[PDB]
Amino acid sequence: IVGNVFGFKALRALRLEDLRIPPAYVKTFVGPPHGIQVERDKLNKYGRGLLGCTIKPKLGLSAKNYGRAVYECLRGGLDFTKDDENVNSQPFMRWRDRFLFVAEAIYKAQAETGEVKGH
Amino acid sequence: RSRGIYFTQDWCSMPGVMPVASGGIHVWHMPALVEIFGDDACLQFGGGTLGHPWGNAPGAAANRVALEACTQARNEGRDLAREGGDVIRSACKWSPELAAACEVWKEIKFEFDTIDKL
Amino acid sequence: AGFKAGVKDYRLTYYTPDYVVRDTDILAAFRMTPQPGVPPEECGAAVAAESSTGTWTTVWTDGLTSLDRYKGRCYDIEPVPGEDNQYIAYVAYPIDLFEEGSVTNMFTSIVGNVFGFKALRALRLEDLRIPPAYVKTFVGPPHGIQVERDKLNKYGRGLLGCTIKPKLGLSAKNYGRAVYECLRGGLDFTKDDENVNSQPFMRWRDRFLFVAEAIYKAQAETGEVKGH
Amino acid sequence: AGFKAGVKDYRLTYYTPDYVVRDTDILAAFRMTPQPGVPPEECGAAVAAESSTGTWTTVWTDGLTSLDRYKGRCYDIEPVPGEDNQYIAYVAYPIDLFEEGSVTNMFTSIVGNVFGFKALRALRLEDLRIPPAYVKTFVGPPHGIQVERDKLNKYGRGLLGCTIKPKLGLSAKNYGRAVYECLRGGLDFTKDDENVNSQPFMRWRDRFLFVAEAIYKAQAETGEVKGHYLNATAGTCEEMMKRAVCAKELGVPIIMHDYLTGGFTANTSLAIYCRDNGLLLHIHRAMHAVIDRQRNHGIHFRVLAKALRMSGGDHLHSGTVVGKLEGEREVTLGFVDLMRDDYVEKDRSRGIYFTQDWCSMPGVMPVASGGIHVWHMPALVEIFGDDACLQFGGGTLGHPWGNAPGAAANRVALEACTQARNEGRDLAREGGDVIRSACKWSPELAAACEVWKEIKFEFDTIDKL
Amino acid sequence: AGAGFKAGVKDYRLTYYTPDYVVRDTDILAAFRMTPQPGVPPEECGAAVAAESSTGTWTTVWTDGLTSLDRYKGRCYDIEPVPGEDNQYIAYVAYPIDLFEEGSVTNMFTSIVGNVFGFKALRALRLEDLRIPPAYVKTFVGPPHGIQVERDKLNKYGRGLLGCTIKPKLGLSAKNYGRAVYECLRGGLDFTKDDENVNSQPFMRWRDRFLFVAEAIYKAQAETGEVKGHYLNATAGTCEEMMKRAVCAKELGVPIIMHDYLTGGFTANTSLAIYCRDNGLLLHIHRAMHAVIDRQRNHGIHFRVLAKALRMSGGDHLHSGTVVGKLEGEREVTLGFVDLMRDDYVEKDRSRGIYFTQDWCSMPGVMPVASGGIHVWHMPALVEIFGDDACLQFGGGTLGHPWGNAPGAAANRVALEACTQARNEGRDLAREGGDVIRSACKWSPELAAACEVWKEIKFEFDTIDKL
Amino acid sequence: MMVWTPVNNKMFETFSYLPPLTDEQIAAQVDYIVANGWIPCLEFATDHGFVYREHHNSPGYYDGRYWTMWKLPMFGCRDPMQVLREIVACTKAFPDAYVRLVAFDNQKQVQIMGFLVQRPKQPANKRSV
Amino acid sequence: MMVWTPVNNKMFETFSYLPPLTDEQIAAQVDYIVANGWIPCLEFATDHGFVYREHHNSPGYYDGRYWTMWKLPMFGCRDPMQVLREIVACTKAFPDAYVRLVAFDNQKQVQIMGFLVQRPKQPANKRSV
Ligand SMILES: O=C(O)[C@@](O)(COP(=O)(O)O)[C@H](O)[C@H](O)COP(=O)(O)O
Ligand SMILES: O=C(O)[C@@](O)(COP(=O)(O)O)[C@H](O)[C@H](O)COP(=O)(O)O
Ligand SMILES: O=C(O)[C@@](O)(COP(=O)(O)O)[C@H](O)[C@H](O)COP(=O)(O)O
Ligand SMILES: [Mg+2]
Ligand SMILES: [Mg+2]
Ligand SMILES: [Mg+2]
Ligand SMILES: [Mg+2]
């Protein structure tokens, strides 16, 4: 649908505004791993919006400082924290170090508050 | 068409996706967010938490208080579009963490001409 | 200099017109169209900030690290000739910001969020300077031109190809039939159309097998290496 | 310019004294001793040629490629002060010559054949300039100093270690028994001796399990994180990996590897395994002095240290200066900066021939080990600062009261010295006084102080600048 | 009042100097050339080396009493002064077989050469020889094939093998590499090879090279009717990469690969030798870096020990030096370690540098490879030194021939075959070698061309690694 | 700057960061349930009132999410007084239990609200120091 | 020969093998932080004061490494008196907690010093018997 046509000389601009995906095509997809209802049921969280927060600065924090920040966020009342979109694995912070420290943080904040936490 | 939906869309029981509202929001936006999204949404406060004058735990509490106050108000039948300012102001008077966040960001708005118009 | 909560201009941290770029920096050239009343310098700084380390308000965690070492820097702003509201903003990014070997990570930083900022009306990334120190972290192309010519044993002219048509709708056997006829008449390559993957009218493995028969037949008939 | 068969001087192609080096070039500094009647320029050119593209006679295949692009180039030759027949030859290698991420390939080129040339009498590689563009192709250390301190939750002082002794001959159960007593008294780490691998008197897997029991018991008793560098060094890569995997299964924080006797190919493999599994990697430099002791021939340790940093390790033995093994102060201070720091300037008085930019590659923790005891503590803290591990084998297991008191003595000594330093005392001048005060106060330390009071290691240095 | 624990330093010689010890047939024996600091007694020095390479440290430890030091200690059992040196000694050290991990050269080196070379108390140390007893030898897989099996696989008998390194060392593309390899092999060479430092690089990626070299090997083989090979380099940054290369060589069906055992290392090498045994690949060993360790007379490890180690770790070929070429190697020394590489049983012989009788207990012999600055005029000397069981390599000597590789290869092959015939006919190559080559020049235009170009060329310099 | 206390400051999901709900406020939440046609239900816990992990450790597995149901969900009930009376009955029978009021939407098939009404025997302002 | 006691002889990293720090010794450590331009911070623990492993077991994973931060790290602070006053404020608010003074270096981005200043209510010489 959007492969080549946007580059045709004969048009000056093109914008795909909408698609009607018929049920017969929709059914061929695995789709979302859980979806809203199952998510609420897994986290045991109902009756309000969920609260999250991206750790900042976007880049530049060490793995240990990342978990430090995450624990303090989660213990104060947020349900989730998150890696910034561009935090992957970098010289200032390798991914597996981050995952381990964030895990420590999640579990500490969970035990302190009594509410399920994530990052 | 007034909401940009050109086609009737039937998802045939495919699970729904939770919308996430994130980017330059703070405690004063809470009523507008709860009004727009309802409960089935996640609201994200980066700067709005890590930029709180007392640190992350108080920042998080401020956001959580604000969201809970707004949710209560809505359930009690208050109109958040009209009364939202008042809900937050009341919560400020009550919670020192919230009050501190309210002061820091009171002036802050993001109002620009929309590019992606219908 | 302590932690002071609140919003301040991006240009106080992220506009640095006296910065001498380093040979390891990734450099971006953005064609930028600010909203009315937004100074180009504040716009360029916003772009640099929100594609590197900064967000909309001051965060205390900055002081745990060195912003100077990690921040993206808008280091130059040229106006565009014959445009009242267009600028080229040049942004330098330290090599530490990027994951080695990951184009995904580079795009995520440089073009991740900034294009959607309210404060700008339009934005276009025009060019990137990828420094050798970053380039060397990539596997890069599996072969490249020279090795490709050497494998195919083809030299001294352009290569000739052809997409099978119609784009969609041909059976696997007809695809091969078409492929053999093309290759045997002098083309080096034929190809699946971009959208030909695996579909009801033609499943991928059936197509691969018939195309293989076609490639080898045309190759034996002509004496020249063939592909699809 | 055609193909002309026959021999010609290397210097016609490979001596280029007007060459401007590129920021991506690998640079080598060779201390070179020519045979009589071989001009230094011809010698340098020969080293440059035979470590890059050239052989002993002209080959026609050169013209299929661009020799200018690929050749190593001897670009400078300095005579050495106070030597009639020694030169420093500087050679520049294009980054194209090297396999990305391979310390093995780098050594193969630069030190592969040239040391055996008839035309020279001796050759020593003194330093290498690894450009950032090459540095970035290496995975590098699995963790590095900062992440290590963060994992162990240890800050503000040097780390304390100890090798179990005797080197060989203890059973698995006795090994763990020794380890528990060491760790509970105040040491952070104990370790397998470099040659403890798997042997008839003690099989590796038995040792790993008893050592694990001992680590966890000492940790629960003291409340401090503890570790023991289990030796993964082995005869094959498969065996090496089996040992690393068992360490991981046991949940222990740190393993070790003898990088030069095991080899760079195995070492780099292990470092990558360690990064992927959160294991810290301690590096023992067994065999280095075979290569690096003599001033006229071999490879200086600073190059072997740079290579280890690229191949990967979290710790690396650095010498003690004051202990039973050789290492001169200024030389040691030079390579310790090369191991730990991000940017090190050229400084010939510390043996640094090139400015070295590590481009954010994690630093390696230096390990001071070998014939040291409590009286050396002030000198060690003065030389290394906090970012070091100090190891006391005999200095712990040789204490008259056993391992736990032995460990306590070393820990008290290190903490006393650290406190004194922080209070502004000058350890170089007041060190003896710091220890003497701590003796008066701690009976364990007093006993160690009495036993080793006389003991010094003062000999003429071989590896002089 | 039995021997208790007494804390403190005492002399190493009280425990580790035992001049009345009778060595056991299972002991590993080391011969160290030792240069003490002034005021350090040779006995104390020898004992220090024995102690610190086995069980002892600098001060007495209480844990000794939990085990039997008598059973485990290394022992300096003899000290000879060196003739015509005021401060040099040969110290002999005996090590119980219990000290070593079975089948691990890595472990053996770690103990014997691990720390002692850096001791303050000595000015210089050199490991000259090791006696590996049969009971330790049997714990090693050893070479994947060995000389006999290798000749049997290639179907090549009755002469030395001929090889050649592709040049320039670095800088040729995959396609050009194959082009050069085909031309060399079709002219008469049995083997070509990757240069030691040709691994995988921007100018030429390994897999591209392997495929083009495979095409070249098979083409030259079909053209000549003789089995051909090319030592594809498996040397790599990681074991996993090394194994990938070996596996691709196997998938290609090529007969032989190579490895730089010292810059790759013993652990990697032993793994590769096991792979080669299990998959029928021959394994050529390049000794890059050896001269960093083994050039100087006063300090390091003699190549004969590195050769013994390689035999145990595993290799079908091992570079041995040429004696007469551009790299150092004295004749008597080389003859000694060539025997140690190839033979089953080698007697003590100090005039060839062999300090110990060495019994290999049927472990396969390694083929010595003579390579480095040799050309057609060296042929008679090389055949005289090595005999048939050797591989002679001509890099510059082939790719530097005025007419190109195929003539180059033919010149080398004619020269070797002439020399071999002459030797078989009873001619003395040491005396008559020049005449054999001169006759062959008169007869073969390719040879003549090579003889003219390199007539003047000799490598004669003062030897550093003297006995 | 006030410090958010880590001692003993356990929370109970929705509304626990507000002042404790008055009787009038609880009644207002019940009216909300009824006005929306949702199904009210009560659940109680006599043991651990918090999520934990005893029996398994994998993602999205937690023990302690299920409490014990009080009677049955009150299907068809449109009377706020009846709901209020069940809260009293439940708390009466289990005066030492955690008790919570939840409501279900059978269209989305999910719990659509919930809050604690009783805990066993930090105050809203002693949460910072 | 004295025997190092295994009974209750828990340690707290840097300086715990010395006599307890006097007020003058603590002030000297504070001066050191200030002279070096490091960022002082306080952390406290009201529960387990030691490393343990509850939630996971792999290499380099431990629970109990993070303590609760007191307020925020004192960025820009060059005043030893200010630091000493925060120690008093923190120990006053949490008189039963483990409390430690730490300092950060933002160049290396790592904690560069740390020692315990308060534990909840072995003596330096009763460690051996
Ligand atoms: O990286 C950021 O800027 C954010 O983390 C928000 O940070 P703050 O909360 O501190 O502003 C989000 O990624 C953006 O909201 C993405 O935008 P969007 O959701 O529109 O795609
Ligand atoms: O084998 C030994 O002697 C040691 O265990 C120290 O024992 P002691 O503490 O009892 O002396 C070390 O492995 C060497 O110091 C290594 O040398 P280096 O650090 O020079 O590489
Ligand atoms: O790379 C080289 O220099 C060679 O290809 C020889 O080239 P030429 O045939 O052109 O001389 C060999 O690898 C060296 O001989 C190795 O030395 P050794 O055999 O002593 O280990
Ligand atoms: Mg983001
Ligand atoms: Mg197409
Ligand atoms: Mg040791
Ligand atoms: Mg070579």
- Ligand 3 centre and the CA of E197: distance in Å? 11
Q: Are residues D206 and D258 in the same domain?
A: yes
Q: Based on the number of CB atoms within 10 Å of its own CB, is D387 exposed (0-12), middle (13-18) or buried (19 or more)?
A: buried
How many whole angstroms from D62 Cα to the centroid of ligand 1? 57
Residues E162 and E33 in one domain: no
Sign of the dihedral through C-alpha C162, C166, C167, C168: negative
Q: Let me know whether E343 and E376 are in one domain.
A: yes
Candidates E207, E202, E204; CA nearest to E232 is E207
Listed residues D82, D113, D138: the one ending a domain: D138
Q: Does C109 touch chain A (CB under 8 A)?
A: yes
- F5, closest residue in chain G (CA to CA): G68
80-99 in chain A: CB under 8 A from chain B: 80, 82, 84
Task: Decide if E332 is inside a domain.
Answer: yes
Q: How far apart are CA G14 and CA D381, in angstroms?
A: 14
Binding residues of A for substrate: 4, 54, 58
How many C×D Cβ pairs under 8 Å?
A: 26
Note whether D51 and D147 are same-domain residues.
Answer: no
User: Which residue's structure tokens are 């551009």?
Assistant: E326
Q: Are residues B68 and F17, on separate chains, in Cβ contact within 8 Å?
A: yes
Distance CA D280, CA D362 (A): 13
CB E80 within 8 A of CB E28: no
Does G56 lie at the interface with D, CB-CB under 8 angstroms? no
Q: Whose CA is nearest to atom 2 of ligand 1?
A: B23
Instruction: Domain count for chain D, please give it.
Output: 2
| Amino acid identity for residue D120 in this structure | L
Binding partners of E (≥3 Cβ pairs within 8 A): C, D
| Residues of chain F contacting A110 with CB distance shorter than 8 Å | 51
Task: Output the residue whose Cα is nearest ligand 2's atom 12.
Answer: D370
Please count the residue pairs, one from chain A and one from chain D, whose beta carbons lie less than 8 angstroms apart: 22
Q: Where exactly are the structural domains of chain F? A: 1-129
Contact criterion met (CB < 8 Å) for A62 and D275: no
Residue positions of E in the annotated binding site? 115, 165, 169, 193, 195-196, 287, 319, 371
Q: Is F4 on the interface with A (CB under 8 A)?
A: yes
C216 touches chain G (CB under 8 A): no
For residue C52, the ligand closest to its alpha carbon is 1
The answer to whether residues E121 and E229 belong to one domain is no
In a domain, E8, yes or no: no
* Chain E from 232 to 261: CB within 8 A of any D CB: 235-240, 242, 260
Reduced 3-state DSSP string for chain E: CCCCCCCECCCCHHHHECCCCCCCCCCEEEEEEEEECCCCCHHHHHHHHHHHCCCCCCCECHHHHHCCHHHHCCEEEEEEECCCCCCCEEEEEEECHHHCCCCCHHHHHHHHHCCHHHECCEEEEEEEEEECCHHHHCCCCCCCCCHHHHHHHHCCCCCCEEECECCCCCCCCHHHHHHHHHHHHHCCCCEEECCCCCCCECCECHHHHHHHHHHHHHHHHHHHCCCCEEEEECCCCCHHHHHHHHHHHHHHCCCEEEEEHHHHCHHHHHHHHHHHHHHCCEEEEECCCHHHHHCCCCCEECHHHHHHHHHHHCCCEEECCCCCCCECCCHHHHHHHHHHHHCCEECCEHHHCECCCEECCCCCCCEEEEECCCCHHHHHHHHHHHCCCCEEECCHHHHCCCCCHHHHHHHHHHHHHHHHHHHHCCCCHHHHHHHHHHHHHHHCHHHHHHHHHHCCCCCCCCCCCCC
Please give the backbone phi and psi of residue D325, each rounded to the nearest 5 degrees, phi first. -110, 155
Which distant-in-sequence residues (6+ apart) come within 8 Å of E462 by Cβ?
D35, D36, D121
Ligand 2 atom at minimum distance from D195 CA = 1
Please answer whether residues G109 and D150 qualify as being in contact, where contact means their C-beta atoms are separated by less than 8 angstroms: no
Burial degree of A38 (CB within 10 A; 0-12, 13-18, 19+): middle
E366 plus E349 within the same structural domain? yes
Atom of ligand 1 nearest to the CA of C57: 10
* D317 annotated among ligand-binding-site residues: yes
Query: According to the 3-state scheme, what is the secondary structure of chain D?
Result: CCCCCCCCCCHHHHECCCCCCCCCCEEEEEEEEECCCCCHHHHHHHHHHHCCCCCCCCCHHHHHCCHHHHCCEEEEEEECCCCCCCEEEEEEECHHHCCCCCHHHHHHHHHCCHHHECCEEEEEEEEEECCHHHHCCCCCCCCCHHHHHHHHCCCCCCEEECECCCCCCCCHHHHHHHHHHHHHHCCCEEECCCCCCCECCECHHHHHHHHHHHHHHHHHHHCCCCEEEEECCCCCHHHHHHHHHHHHHHCCCEEEEEHHHHCHHHHHHHHHHHHHHCCEEEEECCCHHHHHCCCCCEECHHHHHHHHHHHCCCEEECCCCCCCECCCHHHHHHHHHHHHCCEECCEHHHCECCCEECCCCCCCEEEEECCCCHHHHHHHHHHHCCCCEEECCHHHHCCCCCHHHHHHHHHHHHHHHHHHHHCCCCHHHHHHHHHHHHHHHCHHHHHHHHHHCCCCCCCCCCCCC
Domain shared by D184 and D314, yes or no: yes
Please report residues of C whose CB lies closer than 8 A to that of B108: 7, 57
A37, A44, A115 ranked by CB distance to F11: nearest = A115
CA–CA distance, C90 with C45 (Å, rounded to integer): 10
Would you call G18 an interface residue with chain B, using a CB distance cutoff of 8 Å? no
C-alpha to C-alpha distance for D274 and D155, rounded to whole angstroms: 22
Q: Does residue E288 fall inside a structural domain?
A: yes
Is position D198 annotated in a ligand binding site? no
**Could you tell me the CATH number of the domain that includes residue C104?**
3.30.70.150
Q: How was this structure determined?
A: X-ray
Judged by DSSP in three states, C163 sits in strand
Q: Which residue has the tokens 């059914």?
A: A27
Report the distance separating Cα D52 and Cα D97, nearest Å.
7
DSSP for residue C6: S
In a domain, D215, yes or no: yes
- D118 a known binding residue? no
D254 and D402 in a single domain? The answer is yes
C59 touches A: beta carbon within 8 Å = yes
The encoded tokens of residue G13 equal: 């990293």
Residues E346 and E438 in one domain: yes
Task: Answer yes or no: do B47 and A69 touch at CB < 8 A.
Answer: no
Query: Does D158 fall in a domain?
Result: yes
Q: How far is CA D402 from CA D182, D397, E24, E55, F124, in A?
A: 9, 6, 35, 19, 56
- Residue of chain F whose alpha carbon sits nearest to that of B61: F17
- Answer yes or no: A64 catalytic: no
The answer to whether residues D339 and D190 belong to one domain is: yes
Q: End of a domain among E140, E172, E200?
A: E140
D163 annotated as belonging to a binding site for a ligand = yes
Rounded distance from Cα D359 to ligand 4 centre (Å): 26
Q: What is the CATH number of the domain that holds D382?
A: 3.20.20.110
CB-nearest to D150 from A63, A91, A92 is A63
By CB atoms closer than 10 A (0-12, 13-18, 19+), residue D111 is: buried
Residue D112 sits in the same domain as residue D171: no
Please report the resolution in angstroms: 2.4
Superfamily of domain G1-129: Ribulose bisphosphate carboxylase, small subunit (3.30.190.10)
To test the pocket of ligand 1, the residue of A80, A82, A85, A87 to mutate (highest count of ligand atoms within 8 Å of its CB) is A85
Which residue range forms the structural domain that includes residue E61?
14-140
In a domain, E466, yes or no: no
